[PDB]
Amino acid sequence: DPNFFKMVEGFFDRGASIVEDKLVEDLRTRESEEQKRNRVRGILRIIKPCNHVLSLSFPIRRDDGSWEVIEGYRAQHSQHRTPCKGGIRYSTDVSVDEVKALASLMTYKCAVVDVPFGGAKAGVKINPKNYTDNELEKITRRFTMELAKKGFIGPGIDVPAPDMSTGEREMSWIADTYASTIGHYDINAHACVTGKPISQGGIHGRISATGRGVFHGIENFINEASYMSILGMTPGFGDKTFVVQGFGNVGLHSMRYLHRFGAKCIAVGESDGSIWNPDGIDPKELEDFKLQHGSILGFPKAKPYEGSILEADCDILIPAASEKQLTKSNAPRVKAKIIAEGANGPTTPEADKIFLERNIMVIPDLYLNAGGVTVSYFEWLKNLNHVSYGRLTFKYERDSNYHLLMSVQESLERKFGKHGGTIPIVPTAEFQDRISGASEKDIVHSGLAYTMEASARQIMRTAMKYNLGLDLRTAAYVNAIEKVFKVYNEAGVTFT
Template identity: 50%
Template sequence: MSSPAGYSFFESVERSFDKAAVFTDWDPGILEQIKQCNSVYQMRFPIKRENGDIVTIEAYRVQHSHHKTPCKGGIRFSLAVNQDEVMALAALMTYKCAIVNVPFGGAKGGIKINPRGYTPYELEKITRRYTAELIKKNFIGPGTDVPAPDYGTGEREMAWILDTYVAMHPGEIDAAGCVTGKPVTQGGVRGRKEATGLGVFYGLSEVCNMPSVMAKLDLPIGVKGKRVCVQGLGNVGYHTALFFQQAGAIIVGLAEYEGSIWNNDGLDVNKVLTHRTKTGSILDFPGSQNFTKNTEALEMECDILIPAALENVINGENAARIKAKIIGEAANGPLTPEADEILNLKGILVVPDMYLNAGGVTVSYFEWLKNLSHVRYGRLEKRFTENMNHHILGQLEELTGKTVTSLERDFIMHGADEIDLVRSGLEETMITATREIVDIWQKTPAIPDMRTAAYVCAINKVATSYAELGIFP
């Protein structure tokens, strides 16, 4: 995929890398090694469709970095898939994992199809054959390369991948760790579906709670009352909008491929989704203003703009018209380098994708650990915690002569379930990463923006791993 300026997505990632590398002290040879993709697997295989036609499928798997293993990255089904895009997304995965301290190298996969154009049976054949091709070249395994869902894929496809891998590796005790994003019944973890959107919310919330950052933007501290516009109502965009709405933000704009809607008094995300299910479109939602061009809502006045769809939606052509004060990149690569420069000059804070949408890989890491440990989170301590809390509460009530309300009693006595622990771990991860990046940014005034600071953070961590391995004495 090329940007409006004529260079590829991977070249855009390299440009951002080079921009940040000058703020590090690493040897140019190490920096060059970090930039390059370690392994690129391009494949073609035939499948027979239900109508008898035989079609050739184009697919990819890229392992960007082996500084940590296994490699980690999603598999997308899209007609836009090409080698350059998969390479770029694999590189971003390396940097993303480094920033949020998830011990994986970056990888990515893609199959060049429109999943809506195939039956479930055909999609299963494609997925299983793709998995078999990965197995042939040792491009999948719990200690080698662990795929996950991405654009156009979900739990169903991950279950097919797992079943194919298990069938070809009988007796491998850790086989469930060969893929993440699985159904809970197949070794998945609770909280994975909403993880990316929740991570976006946690990351932006932490930014909004930083007095120094909010003062520069002339915004009050906190999420409550912030005016938010979200582009894309897929899994990531929907959950991001929902968590902001639940935290007291006002969702003033929503955009999808059929158009966009706006309401200064706020939109109820679930009601908009219900309206879309009934009518096939978000347009004409009661009380809202329609924009027939789906990018028009991006140019309206708001506090936080969250592109959660595809790449390059904000570019050199429309960046000057953006009026938001904060842009949170929930999608991969929604801004071009030209847009970055324009927005930086306008004083707009861009919170970069390379860590902001790391919620998915963070919770995938938790799922992988669960698969390797063979025990559900919370199983060992939930009842112990509840019994201990019950005892402590009983002692306090006896000593004080007072009784707490039933609502408070339930809250105090609650032992953590799997989803509680997963969300707690995700919140800690996103808050820590945000603080690390902002700290680097503030300590080096020459660093122009938060994206460059995030790359500096990633480069330092990856390069340190290489150095500690003794590869570069």
């Protein structure tokens, strides 16, 4: 097993070269001046290497009066897009190469689902468990301050986010610290970080974003003929059955949505044991079980399955937890036809190769979990807009729908002397629900589905463009690399 640094770096280099040739010729080598068009590919070079990375060793006074110095890092891969966007990890295994790499991932991820950010990331070598809440506040703020002062947090410069180890609490604190300090004069200060609590300027529909994103990703591909054929899919008896490894935020919701739409959740597996049932697990139930107490283990209506679930027989397996789970080791023993990476780096570059060979379609992480980036973009926006989505349109929209209906009625009632006969004005019970429920998430969710969709088709058009099979992952990186490159190309360097 290799590490994300080499992996991602591979990913970039594989794509990078595939793009070169083409990127030269037909797309811009129409004006081949000095045939040094190859030389201008220096852009790529520039791109690849995380641009800035900042290490810091700041202090805090631990509740017991003592003094500890905490280290941390925040890298910023690219600023080809003004605000850098990236999460903040709190784990004692964080390492400048970790961040440097993920921050790289970030920029290419954003590009895929056309979000205007540069990729960045941070880690605070710390184990959240070994510190009292108060101490954690202390740390996040002081971290924020340092980050501000040196240009690593700012609405228009770099906007952090959470990451498993960190949640809306950290994030609110960040926001607050900035806003009351370095950013006291910024009308958009609270747009310095995303993932905030709704009461703090957070966007609704955040939680379920990552997961719903995974849903749609699978959806746009599982509804596509061409692909489903090559696997033999969009089947009658096979239809839809999926196994989801990891019942965390993203797995859970990812099961929710896959269910609601006619899919059977065969098996779910945690850090402990696993669950199985060919009839199907019900999200709500399993969710309320997991919550009510500890884990899924012993779930009533589910026989404890053993043997990595990764080798369960189903159509879609979604790795939603630990890194590199599918390796060259069990890669030739997976049953599922579709692998949907709902986590980051759940499959090794060698496993990718096995899968390719044995026609298994892998929906890349780069894409599949870009839903939470996407919705952050939205939170960001909502914080500039200084208003919650829908606020100034919902009711106007309602009014306008009724008139539309009223016009169909009145009109139809001109083809039969009446005045109450034909009633179209009545919206479908579904429509009526939507009308009376109109709230931010609706618009977010909708936005999310619009990007995931567009992007999927973009990937797909690129896989063809560069003749890759079910090699979505590399079509994806190529996609992002063509993007980032253009922006550079259509400018220069400092002669940009």
